[PDB]
RNA sequence: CGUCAAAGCACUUUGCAAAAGCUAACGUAUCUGUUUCUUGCCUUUUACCAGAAACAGCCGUUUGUAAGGUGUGCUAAUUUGACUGUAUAGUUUUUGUAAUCU
């Protein structure tokens, strides 16, 4: 849409934010919550993550649930942890990746 | 304006209590009386004259508080008080230069 401009008031900065899940880099967390697609998500820690992503934040901040978190590290071992449900802040990611249902 | 809290709220009637503390208008107003002195006019008393000191009275004022009245409400209205009250991922704090090993 033709408010790119950065210099906006409450009802365009919030058109610009749904337009941008519309449309932009975001969209995909849209139809990977219609969708239920899994993601694989990695955080800064060199952790990673896949689940269906139930609700996500303009920040990135997810909520997840049926997580399938491995780490890995002596000699080198892969191990995994499976959570039901978590609240993931938007800060730790570094890269979303979904895995289509199909 | 906002959040939180408790109080029904606005107007009004009556009772009870208090009203200088750091020199200052309870009242930006203004009367009367008693006692003790000093005076004026004076034939004697009341009524008087005009200054002071110490006391009182009356006409009023303000605040607090208690119980009521009227009109509106409790399927909300208003008032009082308190508050470290506001956005924001793009360098000065809160949307990560992290993990890695030592
Ligand atoms: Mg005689």
């Given at each position: 849409?033709?408010?790119?401009?950065?210099?906006?008031?409450e009802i365009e900065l919030a058109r610009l934010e749904e337009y941008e899940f519309s449309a932009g880099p975001l969209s995909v967390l849209q139809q990977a919550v219609k969708?239920?697609?899994?993601?694989?998500?990695n955080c800064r820690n060199n952790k990673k993550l896949l689940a269906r992503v139930k609700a996500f934040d303009r920040?990135?901040?997810?909520?997840?649930?049926?997580?399938?978190?491995?780490?890995?590290?002596?000699?080198?071992?892969?191990?995994?942890?499976?959570?039901?449900?978590?609240?993931?802040?938007?800060?730790?990611?570094?890269?979303?990746?979904?895995?289509?249902?199909?």
């Open positions: 849409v033709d408010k790119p401009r950065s210099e906006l008031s969708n239920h697609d899994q993601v694989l998500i920040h990135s901040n997810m909520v997840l649930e049926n997580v399938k978190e491995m780490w890995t590290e002596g000699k080198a071992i892969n191990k995994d942890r499976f959570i039901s449900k978590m609240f993931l802040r938007g800060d730790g990611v570094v890269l979303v990746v979904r895995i289509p249902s199909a």
